[PDB]
Amino acid sequence: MKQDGEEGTEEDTEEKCTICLSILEEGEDVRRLPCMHLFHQVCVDQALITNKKCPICRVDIEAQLPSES
Ligand SMILES: [Zn+2]
Ligand SMILES: [Zn+2]
């Protein structure tokens, strides 16, 4: 008897969506923003449309457009 101990640990404190505060996986739907963070594509859509900046970093992310949003 258990149960368990631990934790599937294992790794990633490296590429987690800061918006979901959750891990990503290798080849998942992701995005890169100019202040060098890597988020889910879905989460960061909603991030951008809410306000175009890396949320922690404050730097804008509307990369060289030229349009609206
Ligand atoms: Zn996410
Ligand atoms: Zn950033």
Side-chain angles (χ1 to χ4, degrees), residues 14-44:
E14 286 165 271
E15 53 181 350
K16 16 171 64 173
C17 185
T18 204
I19 290 151
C20 299
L21 298 165
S22 294
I23 304 302
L24 304 168
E25 73 175 7
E26 183 177 22
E28 198 178 18
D29 295 272
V30 295
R31 263 280 188 154
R32 160 62 95 95
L33 34 147
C35 166
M36 303 207 297
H37 284 103
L38 171 123
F39 296 157
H40 290 120
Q41 195 160 131
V42 181
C43 301
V44 81

Side-chain angles (χ1 to χ4, degrees), residues 3-13 16:
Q3 127 183 91
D4 318 85
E6 35 67 42
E7 266 189 68
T9 304
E10 314 176 78
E11 271 134 275
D12 190 336
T13 296
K16 16 171 64 173

